[PDB]
Design a protein around this ligand. Structure first.
Ligand SMILES: N#Cc1ccc(CNC(=O)N2CCOCC2)cc1
Ligand SMILES: [Cl-]
Ligand SMILES: [Cl-]
Ligand SMILES: [Cl-]
Ligand SMILES: [Cl-]
Ligand SMILES: [Cl-]
Ligand SMILES: [Mg+2]
Length: 345
């Protein structure tokens, strides 16, 4: 059952992989990635070698979390796991983990910069994001990091969600795309967040497809909040009650009150149905945002919506997230998941 492995050094890194993977070529702090040709399937693939996967309890649990998530995701608009392997022949010598996925070409940033998008293109792209999100949310998973660089798109306009949130303070500081798509309640730690944060990100992405430009390109956290409240209005008393951070509540009330703007005068010339959907996604109070399942039934997607072809996920057991274990116990759980992997049909 065990394949033969061969070794090579790629940029000061020793890679040991099954013979089926050929022509390894580096492409890019949690791991290094190589493109390769998989001779068993004929696919160009990405092979990721995890860096120090078991160096601490936090790292070991993150390794297990990533492998559990990738093994569960089986949907047309979500990245799936093609293979996982280790050169180790036993738990006692187990140290390295390699993950194999489909090699992705362009992302949605490349699309918005270099392509003139019709309203039909916007409909199809956002429809596919929402179809994948309905599946992800049905398993009680929150992506947390939806942005154009985490959305792969091919020549047929077909889309896949990748790079689930599994981010440092410095990574979120300043004029950075890593913060421009985040919901205000998570950007500013207003309250315990939930899956509705992902719908805010979809609204930001859809706006950028319609205009070609970032919706909220803030130069820091506070500048970005000011841009958001200018468009959607300052909070009312109902939402202020739900901000459990007393310090954040007090800062918000320092700001002069502003009404919600007219979205037809912001998104000039857009399909009126697109404007309506944006008003339902970009709602400050997360309790009142439209959900992915509700949005698929909005009239903007009438030509693509098929309620018999929008599937949900198998149940996903996340009880490990509240479990406290030692490094070697997380490592043993990960080893079990590596050796039990069953490849897709
Ligand atoms: N380590 C581990 C571990 C692996 C599988 C299970 C349950 N079985 C399962 O999910 N599959 C789906 C794929 O086909 C076979 C059955 C439990 C623990
Ligand atoms: Cl092989
Ligand atoms: Cl895939
Ligand atoms: Cl190993
Ligand atoms: Cl991005
Ligand atoms: Cl499960
Ligand atoms: Mg990414």
């Amino acid at each position: 059952e065990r394949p033969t492995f061969y070794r090579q050094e790629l940029n000061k890194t020793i890679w040991e992989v099954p013979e089926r993977y050929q022509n390894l070529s580096p492409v890019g702090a949690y791991g290094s990635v190589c493109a390769a040709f998989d001779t068993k399937t004929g696919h160009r693939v990405a092979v990721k070698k995890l860096s120090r996967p078991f160096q601490s309890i936090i790292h070991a649990k993150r390794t297990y979390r990533e492998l559990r998530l990738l093994k569960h995701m089986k949907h047309e608009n979500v990245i799936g796991l093609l293979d996982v392997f280790t050169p180790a022949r036993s738990l006692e010598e187990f140290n390295d983990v390699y993950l194999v996925t489909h090699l992705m070409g362009a992302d949605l940033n490349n699309i918005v910069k270099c392509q003139k998008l019709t309203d039909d293109h916007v409909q199809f792209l956002i429809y596919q994001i929402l179809r994948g999100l309905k599946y992800i949310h049905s398993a009680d998973i929150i992506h947390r990091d939806l942005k154009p660089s985490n959305l792969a798109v091919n020549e047929d306009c077909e889309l896949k969600i990748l790079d689930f949130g599994l981010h440092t303070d410095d990574e979120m500081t300043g004029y950075v795309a890593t913060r421009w798509y985040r919901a205000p309640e998570i950007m500013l730690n207003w309250m315990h967040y939930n899956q509705t944060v992902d719908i805010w990100s979809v609204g930001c992405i859809m706006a950028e497809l319609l205009t070609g430009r970032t919706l909220f390109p803030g130069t820091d956290h506070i500048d970005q909040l000011k841009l958001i409240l200018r468009l959607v209005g300052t909070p009312g008393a109902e939402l202020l009650k739900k901000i459990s951070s007393e310090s954040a509540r007090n800062y918000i009330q320092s700001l002069a009150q502003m009404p919600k703007m007219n979205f037809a005068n912001v998104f000039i010339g857009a399909n009126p149905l697109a404007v309506d959907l944006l008003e339902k996604m970009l709602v400050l109070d997360s309790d009142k945002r439209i959900t992915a399942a509700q949005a698929l039934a909005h009239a903007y997607f009438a030509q693509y919506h098929d309620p018999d072809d929008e599937p949900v996920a198998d149940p996903y057991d996340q009880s490990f997230e509240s479990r406290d274990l030692l490094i070697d116990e997380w490592k043993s759980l990960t080893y079990d998941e590596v050796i039990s992997f069953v490849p897709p049909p």
